[PDB]
Design a protein around this ligand. Structure first.
Ligand SMILES: N[C@@H](CCC(=O)N[C@@H](CS)C(=O)NCC(=O)O)C(=O)O
Ligand SMILES: N[C@@H](CCC(=O)N[C@@H](CS)C(=O)NCC(=O)O)C(=O)O
Ligand code: FES
Lengths: 103, 100
């Protein structure tokens, strides 16, 4: 099915890239996690859901099916789900993100 | 225009007005701070407003020069956005308009 395939694209994108951020261009919280990986000399793979037409809300429902989170940003580092803005922020004050980025 | 009148009226007739989006965590943060202070604000959710929401967001930019949400109004005066409102709350300068 389409929903299976979409679920499989995400598992793939997340295993293949260091940082993946599911995102919306108009969202400050999203801008903030993006900005945070930049200040670390990391370039995240960024999927802007609002730029995918009807596929954006599908992806969001599929992310929620996968990870239980429906909100953006939805953040994966090194194949693992982090997964929100205050979770990524808190995991980068406690400094454990510098570490898990390696490699 | 009929939107300008709507804004000018909503604003002078409620202590706090928040032009907002239901899905926006900054908006939610501003609604939450006013609640901690005892005020229940008048929230206008631009996304619940059919094709008018984006029309409204443009009128507020002309009257305010601010394109973003949340757009916050305190005692008829435009205090701007979320960090701008957070700034005034950490200070204590926010209860001082809310007193009047
Ligand atoms: N505390 C969560 C907030 C996430 C959240 O509430 N996101 C809003 C955008 S700021 C949202 O996803 N709303 C629903 C949507 O845009 O689909 C986090 O830190 O990531
Ligand atoms: N620093 C501003 C941030 C405002 C902002 O960039 N808001 C975003 C949503 S978080 C926005 O207006 N996006 C475009 C739109 O919603 O039309 C504030 O404190 O309020
Ligand atoms: S849409 Fe405003 S913080 Fe996410």
């Amino acid at each position: 099915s389409f929903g299976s395939r979409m679920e499989e694209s995400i598992r793939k994108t997340v295993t293949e890239n260091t940082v993946v951020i599911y995102s919306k261009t108009w969202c400050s919280y999203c801008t903030e996690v993006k900005t945070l990986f930049k200040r670390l000399g990391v370039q995240p793979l960024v999927v802007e859901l609002d730029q995918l037409g009807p596929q954006g809300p599908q992806l969001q429902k599929v992310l929620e099916r996968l990870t239980g989170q429906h909100t953006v940003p939805n953040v994966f580092v090194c194949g693992k789900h982090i997964g929100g803005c205050t979770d990524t922020v808190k995991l980068n004050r406690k400094g454990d993100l510098e570490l898990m980025l390696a490699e």
